[PDB]
């Protein structure tokens, strides 16, 4: 049990692929997602040559233990793969092929500067590290890369599963080692984000904006006021669902830019209560009436910028 | 330790049940579920044969390791199941009854469309791959498809659990799969959400409304704000127990059409309070005194279109 | 291996025990327990007889791969017990003594009807299939059934720790099936519900009862809806530690009932501010009046209603 | 492989020793801290016995396989301990020395009386069951007991890990047992306490004795039903962090005075109205006067007397 | 298999490297971090030694049973690591190359001292504890400690992974322990505690004192309270996020402070209230105006104060 020897000079090449039969368990905050799937490998291994006549049969299976089998990984997993093997049946020039059921919690950074109308890219890393006796290279069997139809992401949009043909070829404490990039191409569903987060937001934004119509300084103060602290519990609840970013997301920057209009509207309830106690409410009118306008005005204008920038 | 061989060209016949002991966990946001159940195989091993009258025995006990088994999986699991085997018998014509307690947990998609008032098929994909000496397929005996009367999943009633006799027969990676679907149909205990959460929602909705008998505009603000606040916390409360969905559910279409009753009641509110500062309070008493009768009546018909477009 | 042999026609009576060590984590939502203890298990092989004398042993030690074990499950665990040999001895009569150490997650339904002043009894459920060769029924050694004094559930008191000595035994999957009850009687201490949600929620409701004296309606408005508001707060604390019931508990009751006597005071502050702006506050302070009275009586008798069908 | 035979009629002592390596998750709620620790065992097997002289060497090293090693468990376990030998060292006269490192999820029952000025004795139980050939007894090799200077368990201090010298010998199931006490010592760092929960509670509580200066009952209802909302959260977020009890906690008794004194506020701020609006103002003004001093001297010798009864 | 034997009487030098290639998971409550890396090993083993021209081969691979190899653990882990060994080659003069791939979780403590604004040194403890044979001491081969490019631990920024090369030599229960400190340090992305804590915080406060603007008490009473329910949100949802320290963090210090801002603001608006009862409101003017100044200088001092205590 030591790796096939080589005709020539040449490196071993493993093909692979990787079939999903499930997906769950994308977490956003973690990062990560769960993967049930097969692994197929492939490589020939002229010590397992037979003659179909002498030993009876056209294929032979072989156990794991019985043969040498590539030691394949994948980078970007917590644990490694819980698999089990299928399959392994070898045909009398040698060619081995290899099946095993996995299931991996895998670590794929996300891109959340336009969430929840946001589109990732989940990867899968193959790798081998090559032997002193020989070199070790990774190749892709198209034929054997997929997803079952039924393969369904909660929340998620399933776009496409591919890999990238060519493996990134690389030294690693001084050994070669060939990756390949399994790619996961999924775009989120942002619908129930619109009667659950966004119109609920508009709602008390605009309720806040009502004080506009009134002179009562505490009927406005309650107003103002009760819809911030509504604001700031789907502020806390949209950022338990997210993790910390060194970037603005686009939720992010509407719910931030939401507090500057709490904030004036603040300022315009207590310059209007001001004027009004120091007897010149004609200006405090004028400010009101401004205000009904300004208002909404900045807040469509803002969020065209926003939107432009963000898409 | 090879599959047994056909007496002419046909598949091996797998024939399962699935028997539940335990069933428990459905996690309604992961649409996942427990369980903990037998599975049934049995298939025909000539190379197992016996004469009943010469061997003094009618049936043979063996270990898993000292014959052949087919290797059936789980298509919808987290990871593979955790399982013993109880028995393995041999009847004399070379008959193979296999038996083995398994636990696992369970990927089915839930349709909450209808919650909390909702019905679900819960599904167990049993699967078989073929061999290249021959092609393996699955069957039912439903003799051995049931489930221990003392089967509880807490907040929900079991119907029934059946199987679609006809597997799903396909190539897979250039091999035959073939395919049962176990079917658990659950329906909702849906009494607990009537004094938890409909009742209360509906109290603080009716307590918005006592604004229609109040000229106290600061009054006013105080209750439609406060109720408003409480729905907010509700509404939190629910979609913490669901998933986010490509679609409106029942709940979340009551739920979000509440708010715009609580918005058009700090319209109504603020109109009011408009017109008596304007001196025009008969004006002010004409839309509160029709706010009276509308809004109970809007709420009631709104609700029975609700209703209809759901069941 | 193979089962002892009959010496007539005799079914294999093996005498079972469970000592308890460690009694831990009561879960109500998921309504298990885990439960850490000693499974003690006894019977005749006479294959595995001996004479003292030339043997020179009272006793023979052996390995559970070296002898005939029966296969005991417990039919009410989420995954196959953990389990540690810790002992087997042989008599010179082939009386084997098996013992081991086990933990388990058990599945035990629990009645919250009259929480949290209810009494539990859960169960561990010992099961044994037949064999071909003969029928395997369970029988209680009453002298090896126990706890140890330190047994602590955090939140419950421990009755008692009794085997059902009669098992059931039924035919499962065309075997028999020998099956026997442990139960565990747990009271739950109800202490600290007092202190933490009954009287909080006592003096909250009493607090909204001080608007019948005071003719305030903004005041009143701020009274009824504030505390409330505390009362949904203290409903959600209370469902998120139960799991959701087909019936109506104790807590759930009062819970529900609370909501009643919030909306009648929320219609009699109504009523009360509706009739001072008529210019009829006489009647306004007779309905004010008898509230005080009927207010703080109706929810007395209402308790004791509620105590009397309940417990 | 059987126990080392004695050369009178003594039990077999086995000399133990732990040294902590690691704590960590002291979890409050579930009474369960994890340990990671060193596991030392010293007994004399005399079959193991040889000549340094013609041997030349001083020291024989055995695999665990290969000797009789005594089953060592623990009592207060969630599981089994997780355990990898690290030496096994015997001496010429047949002195084993016996060294593994483990991780075990320990069940340890909490004071909480005095929290968070709390101290604890966590304990780890080790035994050891009697075989029918001899009666094992435990020992504990002080020089073999100890802890890791950098051993921290966050938010307490380490104090001393020291073991019960003399084993409570006890019979269990008709065989001897022989337990050894460890106590791990820790004082809980009350520091985080004081700013976190202890003061904004107290400045809560001052702000609703601002109503004891204030004439205004609408203001008044809005300053004491407030702050008794943020004594609710206060309330909860502290009985989230600490299991059912069933005893007062230090922390339980001031959270539950504090509603008393909201209550008997509420009632004050009502008399106080209810007399204004009876054209009795001076009356009211001696009771509001007699409160300002009343609130805080009940409130400190209330204080005093709790410290004392808990501590 | 025993350990090399000196050739006088040297310590047995056990070259080490730690390669990242995964890190995720720094929970900042519970101070842990989970790691998955290659793990390298050297050492001399002259038995192992062979001539290239009689073997026909430069490098000789065996499987981890065959030879001796360290036993070596990490001392601040939860359990054991999970590994798995990749190769093993040995070279003519004897010099093994072992390489494992591992996964751990880690624990280290954290210094919350200037958080958000912190920075951490992370550690991974390598420790050999000597045989009777010979003593075992560790060294680091620069050559193989490293990291992927592609290492990111979410919401930190990897500064570098380097060994003190020098290990701490030390005796534990009269045996050599030789243990190496790997570092990974890194520091915390502070950006998006700005718009979601930072800021939110800063305006919740400054709309408190619009109160110095405002002589309406009832009006004061709601703008002081609300706010400082808010401020009581955030000190909740950022002391969740955060273990409980024996010592101040920054934003434990600024989250304190605030609550004196808003103590006294209640103190500023009760003694405004007061005056102008008591038909002095020159003088509550002349106190307003004050804290209309007062307020954010002594808030903007107290930040530089802080500040420079902590930076
Ligand atoms: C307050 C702000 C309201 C939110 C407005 C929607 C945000 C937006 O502009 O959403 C836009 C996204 C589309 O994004 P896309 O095609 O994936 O982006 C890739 C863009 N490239 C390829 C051009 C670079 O969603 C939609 O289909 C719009 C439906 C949202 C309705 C919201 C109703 C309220
Ligand atoms: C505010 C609105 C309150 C909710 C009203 C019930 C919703 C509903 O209409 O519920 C309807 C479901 C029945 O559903 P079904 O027969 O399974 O559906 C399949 C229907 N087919 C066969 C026609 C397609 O519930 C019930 O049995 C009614 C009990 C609800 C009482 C609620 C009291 C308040
Ligand atoms: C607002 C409502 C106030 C709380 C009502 C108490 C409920 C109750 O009455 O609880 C009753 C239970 C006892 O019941 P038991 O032994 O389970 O019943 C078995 C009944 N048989 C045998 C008749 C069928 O509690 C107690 O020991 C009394 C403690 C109550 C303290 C209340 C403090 C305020
Ligand atoms: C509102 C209530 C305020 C709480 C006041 C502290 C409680 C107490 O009284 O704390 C007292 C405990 C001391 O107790 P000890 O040494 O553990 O007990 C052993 C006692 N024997 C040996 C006599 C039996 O803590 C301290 O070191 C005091 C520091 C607390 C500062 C609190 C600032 C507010
Ligand atoms: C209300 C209070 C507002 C918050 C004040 C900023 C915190 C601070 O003062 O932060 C200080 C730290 C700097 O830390 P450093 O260089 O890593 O430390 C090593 C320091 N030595 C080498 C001198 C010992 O952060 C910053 O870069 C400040 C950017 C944050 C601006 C937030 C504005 C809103
Ligand atoms: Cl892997
Ligand atoms: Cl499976
Ligand atoms: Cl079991
Ligand atoms: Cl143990
Ligand atoms: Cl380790
Ligand atoms: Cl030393
Ligand atoms: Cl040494
Ligand atoms: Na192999
Ligand atoms: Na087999
Ligand atoms: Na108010
Ligand atoms: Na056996
Ligand atoms: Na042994
Ligand atoms: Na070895």
Redesign the interface.
Known sequence: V?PPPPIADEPLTVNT?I?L??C??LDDK???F?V?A?L?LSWKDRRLAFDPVRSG???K?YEPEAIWIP?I?F??????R?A?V??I?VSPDGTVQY?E?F?ARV?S?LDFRRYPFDSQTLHIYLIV?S???RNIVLAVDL??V?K?DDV?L??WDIESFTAVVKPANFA???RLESKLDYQLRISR?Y???I??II??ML??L??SW?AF???????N???V??????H??A???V?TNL??????TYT?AII?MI?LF??VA??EV?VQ??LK?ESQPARAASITRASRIAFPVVFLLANIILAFLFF
């Open positions: 030591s692929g079939y039969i499930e769950y368990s973690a990062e990560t769960k049930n097969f197929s049969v056209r294929v299976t030691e990984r980078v970007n997993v917590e644990n490694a819980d089990d299928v399959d049946s099946l059921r299931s670590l950074p590290r032997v002193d006796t034929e054997k997929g079952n369904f909660t929340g690693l404490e001084d569903q619908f129930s984000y009667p659950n119109l609920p709602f008390i605009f309720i009502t119509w009134s002179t009562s300084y505490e009927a103060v309650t107003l006021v009760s819809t911030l602290i509504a700031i519990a502020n806390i609840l950022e993790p910390k970013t060194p970037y603005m992010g931030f507090y709490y904030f603040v300022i207590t209560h001001y106690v």
